Design a binder for this molecule. Structure first.
Ligand code: PLI
Ligand code: PLI
Ligand code: PLP
Ligand code: PLP
Ligand code: K
Ligand code: K
Ligand code: K
Ligand code: K
Lengths: 455, 455, 455, 455
């Protein structure tokens, strides 16, 4: 139901709240973009679960054994064998974080004019696909875009859609299939093993490569153990190893499920791709033997990935998120269902039904939540979706959401109650939330530093 | 009612989640004595609040700045000015922990045959008084000995007993009044500011010295802020400083309210005594400027004592313990009342009223609690009382209790639920709890290494 | 002559002391390529001064205060004001290390077909310039290419070459002047303040921008204090600030002169460029307020850059390298002159004049040095130069060298003796050094993984 | 001859010097007692090698795995088995440092009226012997008191003197033999294995117990390997294990040869003594399961004791001291010979032959060395020797020395040169050093806080 933390607290950092009118000042100073608030002016920081995790005593012991050598570091060897063992891939190239590996994959595996197909888009991923000359095709099933629809494994690829893509475009014009676990923008929704196996069989028969976005693969494995028939007695590690046996490689932002504050990598089975990846890694990241990471960080990430395989750890991680979701839902607050692995997503269309999606309800709601509570959350809606690179119009995602994203091992159920209590009160006067409009818009990944003014 | 943690987690400590059946085997291998359990086999360790506290990020930063010089360390000067500022004593001598400071005080301040009077007593404190030739006299209010009596400031000294001691023995034959805040043996009960002032004035008129056992002075200050009228507008720090203005000095276990794992100190206002204390500290502890502590530890203790002044921190510390007591009591589980600053004491006599004291109900209840929940608690009953080696009979204490002792900043309300729910479930079939018999009993310190089996 | 270390040791790093016979086996298992040695098998690792620096106690304290927020981290603001104060640039964008900042600069500041001119070049820097469409032009003084010429400020730009470039191509077709301090490829040679000013004035009159590669700017400032007249009364910090007042911005590898294991940044004065840089940093690195670094690492870099301003620190850093060069040279061992800020380069062509370049004298000398002393050095000769894949011929560089690269604050003069004495002993029977032949050669990055055997 | 450091520097702490007249001020403010100077006013701190050692990366990794439990800590178990394995004793009781264990031993093993016999006195040791009712008898051979006499194993007990003590006093009036390795006050002089074996045989035949002071046992083992015939091929660990096979237990200040900043212990073979020691440890130090130490400190000390067994580490440690000695001797500076394991001792009788021992030449010289160099050193002469507890006169040691004591793994040969250069210059005008007299004298261990004025 709701287990207690399967760990003790080793050290703490203080949290405080500043008055509402200070927060009012700060929200306008930040152009009503939560990304532009300062860390010290935030009481509970749920902007993202990326890089904000609490490390363990063992990882910190690893941090003291940083072998900082340029090549041949013990830390690189430990990371390399851990990832080979746990994920089952032949080769690994470390990168400083996820988008570093996406930069490598996209340059390596895409010829201009080709299609990349994925189970829903992601921001940095789609940007790197498109700047290397690819058209992104969404092949997640329709249901994944229906916020309130409570079905299991919403992250699953629609096989019918993949078949269609192959018939219409021809297999040789498909660069690869991008399969993310979990699917972040659908609300952290898992992909079933049955689906990964079917995708593999179908792509293999046409000679098409499959690369996983491994960023939240452990959360995903937890959902498989919990809900997919025949997996209830398998270990998280067994499930993780089987997942990747259906892929040709993966990108990974270790800043999520490897339980670290920095770090990532690219894996692949193909020797020639590994060669080419090492050539490129030196341009952007570092030598293949550290990839833009300190030795101590390769060590922390090797230790953290293995810790993530502990059943009680990942069960608690996921059920803590589910608790926040359960509380919000019992009070009538509209959310994406079912609750995903890493965050609760308020459905901004419903929270603010008096605004149109063109008035940026999600961006607005996130600002309002900050002003009323000091809790920081992130826009995951029309602003994040960016512009159509052909028409210049906003991409218009059906999912217009605001994310309360939970860092791993950082907060308690009492913090979840405080967050829930605040959101619930904002709900009582949701009609008070105003439309926003751009006053400054970056040319790509605009959500990061865009500024707004009230309409 | 109960506040959320006024901090978040910076790092975690790894623990074992072994299941009940395996816990039963560890309990058996430990001869049903919780003092013999391995730390690595315990989920939640409530054996003691001494030196088991979680430090902050700021303390851990000070841990990296240990000036390890044998004399004149910068860390000692930081510690020194912090305690002068916050306690308002003229002089300070660091010691490795509390009983090191007690050793010094009792040697400095007692002539053979003299009396030391206090509000109840603690084992190490009273030991050092007696081996320097003092006779102990309990001058706590009589209410403190009624363990079920729910009244405020139960730790207060009975001014009439103090007067009576003075009239009967003479002021010149009283070494000092030892006033402890809070009072451990009464279950962590606080002492009021009015009481501290009344005692200062009576003792001062007769030339008698007063030394505080300041080990949980911050918990004590929280009770005064919360319950003593006139202190609603005072900061914890103002209250702490006023408390000590009524003393000639103090002994301190930093391992409790200074939020550290090791450390303590001795304070006094008198120049001549400070001189004598520096002559003696070098005998047992170290220099006046390290006192048996590493430089990093004087630094962590200087930083920890200042953090302990934060209202929200100590409010949450005391209310978290109170939460555990309230929950037990609402289900009819018998406890010492009112709940103290640092622990909850189960009344094992009443909990296991089908067992006689000779069947060690507290020792047996402590073993049951570990088996059922992974929680370690401390026996504080007939076993810890020891055996009269002259007559061979048990010392038979009036309190037959299990102590649930709460380290600062280590656990959450969900851990408190694990503890409460498990004890509550045992309470519902309390008649099934079995008596214990010795299978190995040493001559001394029997509570530390004795082994038992079920009757 | 040579100052003592202006610091003492706070903690040590454990190394293997394996004997010569065992070192011969590790060298053989590594195919006689020092780049393939395991860090755990190396006594003294002079492969590189990049990211291998020892941090202080203060830096390690900042490592405990990482504010890991995704945006608005306190550590970023500390880094930001430190670089503004010390470099005197208006704006700063952090990057995970140097080549991340170079990626950004070259994309922001180059239109296809434009020229970038600099005092020699570095591989990553020049790569990013060229892939954004620039043509590189070397405008260093001709003396810089005479590797045995013992003159001051060998890194200076030839103003006449700059003028000639301007006259021939037009100012509008020059993207920027890339001025590096120190100049790595000339062996770590400094650039004078007069040169920096002369270049600022000529470029400014034509509207041309100047960006510094500031990677070893502090070593450079030490040379100006020591050798450029008029700077005897200036602090290292005054000199560093004046250097940058002659630039429009810079790229920085903190892994060199900021005394850290990871980290770098981009600076500029121009508001519009700062805006564009923040639009791009999110593509490859992270937010304008972490740039692909953990919060603790921005903190360590802010603290390290300020420590690097201490005169005694940088004096000792540069004179320790000089000590190694002086000792080699006094025994007749041929080196690049004068000795630079960060390394000594052995002339392997002259050292092994019984071998032809096709027998890889630098690669072989590097292997010998490890076998005889436990010291790892880097090949910087025909092997690192790579192979023309069009014609299949070696690129044949004029410099056939072994680089003895000195990390900051890691080694003592006795380690420098181990290195010198071992090289000196090899020099005395240099004729016994054997040529190498490939037994495995990859198509690219051949210096990283190639294996050899003796001829 | 002089090996290089068999480790790299992992982190540093800054050192600086203040002007001579600031130092002049500071020396008089400190009553001309070097113990009373502040750490931050000292440039190179050679007061003592106790607790001032640099820890390794592995020890600091152990520091992150502090298991702070009150009983059953993993850290206590690791310390316990390491000491059982390496020293060979049956039982261990941790204490916060050396004099804590001496306090226990003296209370446990001495009946009033009995004699304790040792190879030369030590300050805290003799004080704890005498306050428990023992007469100290020196049975080191005469030669150990002759400063300039260069003979091997000066720490050896004179068997003739031990035999005499037994005949004159009777074996049952001898509490135990105290055998220290090395002998600190003779200048850090080693004891031979032959001598330890002869002492064991002779004491065993009379039923007399032998307890070692293990504080510098690893330095001692190094001297045996280097100089005692038949031990040249034994490992340091084998030699350490054999040493202790001749003892009934030991006291240990881990702050020396266990390479830590705090910590110690008491070992013994006898079960009944172990029982009694645990009873006493709770009075002064803590529970037998932590002994006044944080878990992380038991861990660091377990790791450090094992590191100390590495041949190259202890060889370098000892030869670095020998280098300082060689330099001083080549210049004609008078020292204790041969040079011991941990410090060079200037012979103050010879350095200041114009003063009498009653004018405290050693105390004076130490002050002078500070004023001229900023180097701190310690009095080891008439002041340290204390007063005869029968006559009230100063004990008058023949050895009137000033100690330049080297912390482990903290300084370099260049620091040793700076120290040597300074001492050598002070020597040129040694006639300038003035007599001192007490203005304040503590009643015991007076050297710690005594203050003086020039005669
Ligand atoms: C599924 C997925 C992500 O969610 C992702 C970054 N997402 C963030 C930081 C988030 O807040 O969701 C990235 C990019 O990783 P990076 O932030 O560059 O380490 C890749 N995959
Ligand atoms: C041989 C020996 C010592 O040298 C010693 C303390 N000596 C110090 C601190 C010194 O500076 O020599 C002690 C007392 O240890 P302690 O400083 O209490 O950990 C015991 N034995
Ligand atoms: C624990 C305690 C002490 C002793 O302090 P230590 O640091 O354990 O020696 C003294 N007084 C009270 C009231 C205590 O609880
Ligand atoms: C090492 C170096 C760089 C690159 O920095 P990284 O942090 O290695 O990417 C750039 N310029 C010079 C002169 C360098 O030496
Ligand atoms: K982070
Ligand atoms: K502890
Ligand atoms: K590094
Ligand atoms: K110390």
């Amino acid at each position: 139901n709701y287990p207690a933390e399967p760990f003790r607290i080793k050290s703490v950092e203080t949290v405080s709240m500043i008055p509402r009118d200070e927060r009012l000042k700060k929200m306008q100073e930040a152009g009503y973009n939560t990304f532009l608030l300062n860390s010290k002016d935030i009481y509970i920081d749920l902007l993202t679960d990326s890089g904000t995790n609490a490390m363990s005593d063992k990882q910190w012991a690893g941090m003291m054994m940083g072998d900082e050598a340029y090549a041949g570091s013990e830390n690189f060897y430990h990371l390399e064998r851990t990832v080979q063992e746990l994920f089952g891939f032949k080769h690994i190239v470390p990168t400083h974080q996820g988008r570093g590996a996406e930069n490598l994959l996209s340059q390596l595996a895409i010829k201009p004019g080709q299609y990349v197909a994925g189970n829903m888009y992601f921001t940095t991923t789609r940007y790197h696909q498109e700047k290397n000359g690819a058209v992104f095709v969404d092949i997640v099933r329709d249901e994944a875009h229906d916020a309130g629809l409570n079905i299991a494994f919403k992250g699953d690829i629609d096989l019918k859609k993949l078949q269609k893509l192959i018939d219409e475009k021809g297999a040789e014009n498909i660069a690869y299939i991008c399969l993310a676990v979990t699917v972040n923008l659908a609300g952290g929704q898992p992909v079933s093993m049955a689906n990964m196996r079917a995708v593999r069989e179908l792509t293999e028969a046409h000679g098409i490569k499959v690369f996983y976005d491994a960023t939240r693969c452990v959360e995903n494995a937890y959902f498989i153990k919990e809900q997919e028939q025949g997996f209830e007695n398998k270990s998280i590690a067994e499930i993780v190893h089987e997942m990747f046996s259906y892929a040709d490689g993966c990108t990974m932002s270790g800043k999520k499920d490897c339980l670290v504050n920095i770090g990532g990598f690219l894996c692949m089975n193909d020797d020639e791709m590994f060669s080419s990846a090492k050539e490129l890694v030196v341009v952007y990241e570092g030598m293949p033997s550290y990839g833009g990471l300190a030795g101590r960080d390769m060590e922390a990430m090797a230790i953290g990935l293995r810790e993530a395989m502990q059943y009680e750890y990942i069960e608690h991680r996921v059920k803590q998120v589910r608790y926040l979701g359960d509380k919000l839902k019992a009070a009538g607050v509209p959310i994406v269902e079912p609750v995903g692995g890493h965050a609760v997503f308020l459905d901004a269309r419903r929270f603010c039904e008096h605004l149109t999606q063109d008035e940026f309800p999600a961006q607005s709601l996130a600002a309002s939540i900050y002003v009323e509570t000091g809790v920081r959350s992130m826009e995951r809606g029309i602003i994040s979706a960016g512009r159509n690179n052909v028409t210049g119009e906003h991409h218009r995602p059906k999912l217009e959401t605001v994310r309360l994203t939970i860092p791993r091992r950082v907060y308690t159920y009492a913090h979840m109650d405080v967050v829930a209590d605040g959101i619930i009160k904002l709900y009582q006067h949701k009609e008070d939330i105003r439309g926003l409009k751009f006053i400054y818009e970056p040319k790509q990944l605009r959500f990061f530093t865009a500024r707004f003014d009230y309409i």
